[PDB]
RNA sequence: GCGAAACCACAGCCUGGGGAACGGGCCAGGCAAUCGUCGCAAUGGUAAUUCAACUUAGUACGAGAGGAACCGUUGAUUCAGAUCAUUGGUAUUUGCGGCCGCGGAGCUAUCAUCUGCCGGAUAACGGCUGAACGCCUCUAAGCCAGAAUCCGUGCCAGAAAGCGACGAUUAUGUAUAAAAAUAGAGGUAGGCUACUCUCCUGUAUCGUAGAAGAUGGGCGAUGGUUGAUGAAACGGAAGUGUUUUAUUGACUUGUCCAUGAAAUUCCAUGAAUCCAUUGCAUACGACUUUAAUGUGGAACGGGGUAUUGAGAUUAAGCCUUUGUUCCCAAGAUUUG
RNA sequence: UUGAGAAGCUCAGACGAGUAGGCAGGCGUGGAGGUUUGUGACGAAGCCUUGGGCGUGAGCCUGGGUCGAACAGCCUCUAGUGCAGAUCUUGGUGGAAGUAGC
RNA sequence: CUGCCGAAGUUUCCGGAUAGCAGAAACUCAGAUCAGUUUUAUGUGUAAAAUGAGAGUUUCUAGUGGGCCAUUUUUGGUAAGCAGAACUGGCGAUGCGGGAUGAACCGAACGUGAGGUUAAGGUGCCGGAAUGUACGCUCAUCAGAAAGGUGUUAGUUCAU
């Protein structure tokens, strides 16, 4: 299934991974937005990733996450570079995206692709000692915004299951039981 | 608008090509739901179409449609060789392609 | 290289690119101020520096003066803190707005028909229900809060009539407290005896004089301690309690290129940036120093007010 | 105003590799470009720098003498930032007094007076604790300490192709929101302690019934679906959308009927700029205030003021003007 | 069954790089004898044109616009016969350049 | 302008005459001879079965009458490389797929086209094609595509 504006959500997730499916995605004529970009992980220590930093100058993983597709797409063909605009890498979850459905690459988590005890770096603390100077901003949304939500989904919760005790006490349910509804 | 769409949605990927060499003549479609080259068996045959407007009006419309074939499958994950009567522009690719269900063999 | 590239400064009215930090357990207080230069002239003080070679001595040293009267607090602007950066939400200017401050707003004073605002004065007099909303949302959602107020350009003796308006953050208290104290403050003259004790260290920010075809250029000079902020009303503000003797701060014969103080001035010790009648910002020290120097108290001894232009002899 | 010759395959960002130069073309690369007013900072440059001594203490060490870390002071710097107050000169007040004797203003300065960074990450380096190696073990876990370095931090500039606030204003169902573990989470229930249940995806869930969804007859809900407006709260971030509804307008295939919908009789569909003013500028623009009927400004008349040595010039980048008149409630232009 | 331009028509199979070089068939220009009882003031030749065609190609036929006095297809004869270069000859014209400058 | 054939690129004696390659003609044969062929066997050569192809002459006439690379073979070397002769192919007269690009490497040698399938190489993205399946190994704090290691991985052997 795809659709015309398709939000994933990047914790737990691997960059490169992460990449190749935005990549190839990108090139079908879909839009994609990612949210929490800080939350992506890179497998190696943390000092290792530090030390490819250092070697190489954008400290936002938003515009690190959208630099490292942009060499990943034919950036010189006008194709590419029109297919860059329709990706929006943002940090954390705007209120523009926020009250929409997240959905996740089973080919780039974690717990799907690294073994365990194997160590592995978060963007967004690799950025915090680089440049970044936002993390506590951006953090206190992400607790401002997740308690809105949990309330949001308590009322929703609350609202399923009277609703499932009213399809429950439906005495049409079980009449037509037979097609497995 | 519920209804509608006796066809299947399809995604113009590009055209068969080797890695420097590009022959136009036929183009790849990624339906949705075929992930298999068995499950592609289904949608050969069938008539795929090309849907697009224009600033001028022709017989009162302003549509202009470019029919297709499904030929044969392309790989493993679903992907089909589709020819037109007039090869797709270069510019259509990561575009839309209606599949109908005609010819139908079921 | 750190001041390269050596170009003029975009803004004749010195800009402080930063602000010292905003502690909430401080009480809400101003951070900043807006002077004029008047000049540069010699006084002796008493050095009271334990351990010094030239302990509990008088010693002549430049003291520059710039008037620095009471500044109207204009508006109060909102800015929310983002991800971005800082994000200014919004901004809440009083229903009553200074001449001088509409004609700095208009490039054409007397072209203008006076009508800039003149909509949002009529809307916050037939309704602050959207006021209240807005300084609601200031101190429910803002983040950064930056007070806006005109230098009293008229009181002074300046050619120019705009009034040299700027916004000020600012620091302590709550952002209900600081919305509550601008509000207070909205429309009401504050002056820099109340903001500065004269007994601390500052920094002050201006641009350089240009010397024709190396100039005009921004700096920010700090370590810049007062050695006193005196009063224009006050008789007594050039005089010390040494020896009396009241006398106006201004030169015999009328301040070179600016004339005569008659409003609150403030005199510090050291050259800053500019030319005389110019517009100068003295704010706070982002970083406290605790060195003697900036710790000591400062009393002058003897005021020269000999005629600065020409050879003056005569106090 | 009058006016060549030379030259010319075609061009012109580099980075590398490209085997034979290859860069001037090839591949990987980067690069590749309404009027306003006040603010924000992506980004870079970058800053303080090099050494000391006294105090400290004239003492830990040291038989004593000589001389402790740290504290502040005294500084010497270098560099940058300033300014002409202080100091000297320079000096178109080239002003003065007798070509000289000098020179105010202003400029200038290791010629002057001066002002002048922050904590971390850690390097070297030494650790503590702690496995392998029941201990031990800078270390494999962890906890550290510690650099004129680095990063931060501060300063400077600002994306000319960044942003905010703010004033005036000529396609085919385009369907869907928890957080968080995942090596256990969530819910469920009891008083954080004892429970239980689900997961093992979305092929899920919601919606999808009618001449694009007709005409009416009902029945049945007497509910539901919504449209229309009347705003209430929530939503700073990018709140611009989430509900709450108040009433009304319809619709209702919720259960049903009766007609109706076609020969297309096989696919193609008003401000501001220039302008004047302006010196606060000055490769030239820019910059700079004022300026469109009033402290209006601009000019002089001056005065004040110092200069020279009382007098004259007397603000010119010395001050000021209850003095005088001039001009003008502009001249055009730009721009929705 | 008409399919004898016997230099014709028809049938079958394999094959197809190319320098130096060898062989063969053609296209085009000026003029010459024959010819088309050829074309032309109701418009020759030429010229331009994103008109239409033909040939693998050299080339050709045609529409439109200009144009105004000649021209062509076919069989042979014949030669001062086909150009992108030669720091080629002649004429024209640009950038350089409103530059050096006067 | 198109079509066909198309070398030699060097032996050998000695600027050449030969030759050779390519043609062009004339001949005689396929029941006749052959082969950068392979066997059989007699003593690596020679002689006599298979596999294929028709084979042999005479005459006369254009062009070439270099190399580079690679393989190998050796000899010495000579700091060490290497050099020196050869040996045989390929390019040279030859485009295409692959090797990031790249004249020597891997494939394959060319009329215009349609479909089909492949070679070499590839299927994360750029990039056409499985983010295939099974099994291990790799932790790098410069991976990856002589040795040392309080470096691990699997361990083996010997001691208790």
Not at chain 1, 46 to 51: E, V
Not at chain 2, 25 to 42: L, M, N, P, R
Not at chain 3, 20 to 31: G, N, Q, R, W, Y
Not at chain 3, 89 to 118: D, G, I, P
Request: glycine share 8%; with cysteine.
């Amino acid at each position: 299934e795809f659709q015309k504006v398709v939000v994933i959500d990047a914790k737990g997730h691997l960059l490169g991974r992460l990449a190749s499916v935005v990549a190839k995605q990108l090139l079908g004529g879909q839009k994609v937005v990612v949210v929490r970009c800080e939350e992506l992980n890179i497998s190696g220590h943390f000092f290792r990733n530090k030390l490819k930093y250092l070697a190489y100058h954008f400290r936002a993983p938003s515009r690190i996450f959208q630099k490292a597709v942009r060499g990943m797409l034919p950036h010189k063909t006008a194709r590419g570079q029109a297919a860059l605009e329709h990706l929006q890498a943002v940090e954390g979850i705007p209120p523009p995206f926020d009250k929409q459905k997240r959905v996740v690459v089973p080919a780039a988590l974690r717990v799907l692709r690294l073994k365990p005890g194997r160590k592995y770096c978060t963007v967004g603390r690799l950025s915090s000692e680089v440049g970044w100077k936002y993390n506590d901003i951006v953090a206190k949304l992400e607790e401002r915004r997740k308690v809105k939500s949990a309330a949001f989904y308590q009322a929703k919760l609350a609202k399923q299951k009277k609703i499932a005790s009213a399809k429950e006490a439906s005495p049409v349910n079980q009449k037509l039981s037979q097609f497995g509804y | 608008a519920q209804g509608h769409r006796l066809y299947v949605k399809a995604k113009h990927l590009s055209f068969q090509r080797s890695k420097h060499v590009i022959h136009p003549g036929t183009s790849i479609v990624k339906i949705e739901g075929c992930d298999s080259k068995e499950e592609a068996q289904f949608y050969l045959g069938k008539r795929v179409c090309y849907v697009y407007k224009s600033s001028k009006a022709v017989r009162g419309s302003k549509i202009r449609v470019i029919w297709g074939t499904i030929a044969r499958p392309h790989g493993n994950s679903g992907a089909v060789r589709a020819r037109f009567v007039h090869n797709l522009p270069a510019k259509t690719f990561g575009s839309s392609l209606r599949v109908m269900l005609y010819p139908s063999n079921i | 290289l750190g001041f390269l590239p050596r170009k003029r400064a975009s803004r004749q009215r010195g800009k402080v690119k930063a602000f010292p930090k905003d502690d909430a357990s401080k009480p809400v207080h101003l951070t900043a101020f807006l002077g004029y230069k008047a000049g540069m002239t010699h006084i002796v003080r008493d050095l009271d520096r334990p351990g010094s070679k030239m302990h509990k001595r008088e010693i002549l040293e430049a003291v520059t003066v710039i008037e620095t009267p009471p500044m109207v607090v204009v508006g109060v602007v909102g800015y929310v803190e983002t991800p971005r950066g800082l994000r200014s939400l919004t901004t809440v200017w009083a229903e009553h707005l200074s001449e001088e401050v509409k004609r700095r707003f208009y490039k054409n004073w007397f072209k203008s028909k006076k009508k800039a605002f003149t909509k949002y004065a009529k809307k916050y007099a037939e309704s602050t229900q959207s006021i209240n909303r807005e300084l609601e949302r200031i101190k429910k959602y803002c983040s950064v809060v930056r007070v806006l107020a005109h230098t009293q350009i008229r009181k002074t003796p300046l050619a120019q009539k705009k009034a040299h308006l700027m916004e000020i953050q600012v620091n302590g208290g709550s952002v209900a407290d600081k919305v509550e104290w601008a509000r207070e403050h909205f429309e009401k003259t504050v002056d820099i005896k109340s903001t500065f004790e004269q007994n601390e260290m500052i920094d002050v920010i201006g641009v350089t004089r240009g010397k024709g075809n190396a100039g005009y250029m921004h700096r920010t000079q700090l370590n810049s301690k007062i050695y006193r902020i005196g009063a224009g009303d006050d008789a007594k503000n050039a005089s010390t309690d040494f020896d009396a003797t009241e006398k106006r701060i201004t030169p015999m014969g009328g301040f070179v290129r600016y004339g005569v103080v008659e409003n609150d001035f403030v005199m510090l010790n050291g050259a800053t940036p500019g030319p005389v009648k110019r517009v100068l910002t003295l704010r706070k020290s982002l970083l406290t120093h605790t060195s003697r120097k900036a710790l000591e108290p400062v009393s002058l001894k003897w005021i020269d007010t000999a005629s600065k232009f020409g050879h003056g002899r005569f106090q």
